[PDB]
Write a protein that binds this ligand. Structure first.
Ligand SMILES: Nc1nc2[nH]c(CCNc3ccc(C(=O)N[C@@H](CCC(=O)O)C(=O)O)cc3)cc2c(=O)[nH]1
Ligand SMILES: NCC(=O)N[C@@H]1O[C@H](COP(=O)([O-])[O-])[C@@H](O)[C@H]1O
Length: 200
């Protein structure tokens, strides 16, 4: 299966996906990295690995639909089968999500359904949980609500901040995002006709 990874920043999840997809038994190959922001570190990581990059600046488009449309064009150009959102910080439009239904994955730094949205660690620290974690899920139109593929729990330590907790949680993100990608690329897991997760 041919994969596009979309990023907005550092790219530690991208790097973990690059490392796993180059293992001999990997059922996924990463063919293109797309950033919505110029000059971010994930673009360097992609180039060092010999993977084509594109920047598609959301700020240059009238609305979400046109922006997603420009992404979809790249996706078709590289004949992509699966899309991974890896630190990608934009909400995607309905029809784009419908088109890639069953074929687009996201990593989110909480145990969904808790702490949806773009500041999950701040919410987790404000609420005072002692266990948080991360989630890989299929992308549905409703944000951070698609079908869950894998999760991993991570302790919150007393005195944690967003810096120290996100560092601990990323260590677990870097394990389940490659595992989930391999599950979907191999056809072991798919989005079922009834809309629930199906293990084959
Ligand atoms: N339809 C859909 N899109 C999705 N995108 C993602 C990607 C990862 N999750 C996100 C959840 C919420 C946001 C969010 O507040 N964004 C703001 C930009 C924030 C800013 O810089 O000011 C926006 O864009 O205005 C972003 C990403 C998942 C995800 C999903 O599950 N469904
Ligand atoms: N709403 C999605 C979200 O919060 N994504 C989070 O952004 C970070 C990106 O790091 P990276 O650029 O080093 O992979 C990761 O922790 C990811 O789970």
């Amino acid at each position: 299966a041919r994969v596009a990874v979309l990023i907005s920043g550092t790219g530690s999840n991208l790097q973990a996906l690059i490392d796993s997809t180059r293992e001999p038994n990997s059922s996924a190959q990463i063919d293109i990295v797309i950033s919505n922001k110029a000059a971010v570190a994930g673009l360097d990581k992609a180039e060092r690995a010999g993977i084509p990059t594109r920047v598609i600046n959301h700020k240059l488009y009238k609305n979400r639909v046109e922006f997603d449309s420009a992404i979809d064009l790249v996706l078709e150009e590289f004949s992509i089968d699966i899309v991974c959102l890896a630190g990608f910080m934009r909400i995607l439009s309905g029809p784009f999500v419908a088109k890639w239904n069953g074929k687009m994955l996201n990593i989110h730094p909480s145990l969904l359904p808790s702490f949806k949205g773009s500041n999950a660690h701040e919410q987790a620290l404000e609420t005072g949980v002692t266990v948080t974690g991360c989630t890989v899920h299929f992308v549905a139109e409703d944000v951070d609500a698609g079908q869950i593929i894998l999760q991993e729990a991570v302790p919150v330590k007393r005195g944690d901040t967003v810096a120290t907790l996100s560092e601990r949680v990323k260590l677990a993100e870097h394990k389940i995002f490659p595992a989930a990608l391999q599950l979907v690329a191999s056809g072991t897991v798919q989005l079922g006709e009834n809309g629930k997760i199906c293990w084959v």
